[PDB]
């Protein structure tokens, strides 16, 4: 709330909460790194939803504390001092907190201080699943991780591999680009198309009514909320692009049929199936770091029944899928997102954009996100919630 000019929010009556969520949605799980990236007793720093956080692994378990001392607000990470296995001591005046509950249990500079045991540093739930580290950037008891994950990601036999990086664009631009039916046009020359013999249209000529363009999911048992892109169920795919009726570009006529099952889910994770191969799936998150950047958390999943298969998949991922798909295909998505930054940077693009038919999918997502998000992260959450009696 109060993230965007009220005049602008009053204009977008169909999805104001979404436009206001420049910092992301609070009270949702978010992947921030892979398990193998955080080692025992080796605290790591990160910024999520605008908040600086510290993550550490103690006796194998992950703990998350806000990286900001309660005293004078410095980042503990400037000079980490973990004097005991279960605690971290601020380098400034030695206020010491327990990783398990953030309680201020000691203060080396004043053992008699009345603050001892009467203050608590913010902590956030952390959970590891499929080799990924998820942090619940929210308050109170967290919901099951499954609620904030796409279908099948947590399947017992689904082997997950991936890559993560920081991209310079607001998370919403990333989400919309990923779920944008017609943006497929930017991938027409991707090495993956030719190299993996893909069938890939240039776009779609919609068919049927509005309701038929998507399937809004709000009745899932685990509580997940999302939208499926069904433009291809009544639409005629475009393989011959014309200008003035003359053919100037053609789509790809490969044999492999992929990405005909696309869905976006809160808090902001896309599921493309099957992709990049007929027997694989891609799940990618666009995690809010701050108003201008996000984590592009990419994962590819493929069923594996045992170690031999998991190992085989890993070798194929490193030598083919990572360079050819995650990079060779999605790299164009990265600069496309960056290209929309200016138009939306002053929040005016949310009013001036001129949409066309396929954007019906994006609109469905904006409405779903606005109605089922679990909270709007505000700058006040970052500095400290304010309230006057």
């Amino acid at each position: 709330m109060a993230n965007v000019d009220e005049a602008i929010l009053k204009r977008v009556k169909g999805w104001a909460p979404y436009v206001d969520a420049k910092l992301g949605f609070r009270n949702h799980w978010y992947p921030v790194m892979f398990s193998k990236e955080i080692n025992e007793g080796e605290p790591k720093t990160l910024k999520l939803l605008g908040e600086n956080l510290l993550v550490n692994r103690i006796d194998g378990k992950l703990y998350c504390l806000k990286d900001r001392c309660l005293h004078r607000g410095v980042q503990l990470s400037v000079k980490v001092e973990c004097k005991t296995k279960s605690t971290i001591t601020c380098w400034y005046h030695a206020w010491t907190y327990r990783w398990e509950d953030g309680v201020l249990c000691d203060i080396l500079t004043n053992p008699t201080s009345a603050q001892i045991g009467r203050q608590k540093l913010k902590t956030y739930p952390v959970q590891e699943a499929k080799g990924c580290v998820f942090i619940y950037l929210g308050d109170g008891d967290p919901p099951p991780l499954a609620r904030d994950t796409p279908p099948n990601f947590l399947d017992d036999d689904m082997e997950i591999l991936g890559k993560n990086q920081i991209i310079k664009s607001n998370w919403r631009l990333a989400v919309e680009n990923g779920f944008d039916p017609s943006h497929i046009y930017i991938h027409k020359d991707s090495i993956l198309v030719k190299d993996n013999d893909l069938a890939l249209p240039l776009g779609f000529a919609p068919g049927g009514d509005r309701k038929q363009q998507t399937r809004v999911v709000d009745d899932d048992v685990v509580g997940r909320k999302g939208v499926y892109d069904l433009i291809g169920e009544h639409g005629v795919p475009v393989f011959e692009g014309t200008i003035g009726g003359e053919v100037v570009r053609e789509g790809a006529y490969g044999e492999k049929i992929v990405a005909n099952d696309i869905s976006i889910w809160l808090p902001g994770v896309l599921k493309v199936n099957p992709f990049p191969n007929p027997d694989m799936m891609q799940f990618e998150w666009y995690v809010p770091i701050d108003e201008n950047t996000h984590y592009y958390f990419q994962t590819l999943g493929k069923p594996c029944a045992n170690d031999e298969e998991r190992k085989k998949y890993e070798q194929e991922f490193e030598s083919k899928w990572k360079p050819m798909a995650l990079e060779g295909f999605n790299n164009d998505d990265i600069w496309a997102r960056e290209a929309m930054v200016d138009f939306y940077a002053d929040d005016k693009g949310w009013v001036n954009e001129i949409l066309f038919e396929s954007d019906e999918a994006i609109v469905a997502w904006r409405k779903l996100a606005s109605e089922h998000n679990q909270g709007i992260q505000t700058q006040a959450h970052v500095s400290g919630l304010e309230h006057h009696h």
């Binding site: 977008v12 009556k13 949310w350 009013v351 001129i354 949409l355 019906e360």
Partner: protein, 104 residues
Amino acid sequence: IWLKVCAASDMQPGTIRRVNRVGAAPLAVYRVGDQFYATEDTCTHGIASLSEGTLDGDVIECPFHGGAFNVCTGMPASSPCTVPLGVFEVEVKEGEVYVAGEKK
């Protein structure tokens, strides 16, 4: 040529009714007080349906970006709309609402 849309009483004051026309773009019929007007239903700024917007007097506000049009003249009343809406004359005879088949 004229299209018999509905009985005047089928619309409460300040409401909008979308009129689908096979093989053609949909229209929007507005009841402002006891008067009726008609325009193309699709906002000229995007894909929004004006029949799902907000009527304030004789001005229809688009549900998507807040753009607006005067339903009597079809001219834009609020940005970001810039392209005038197509207008259709309306006639109410014996309590029945008819809308011109062609824009004018």
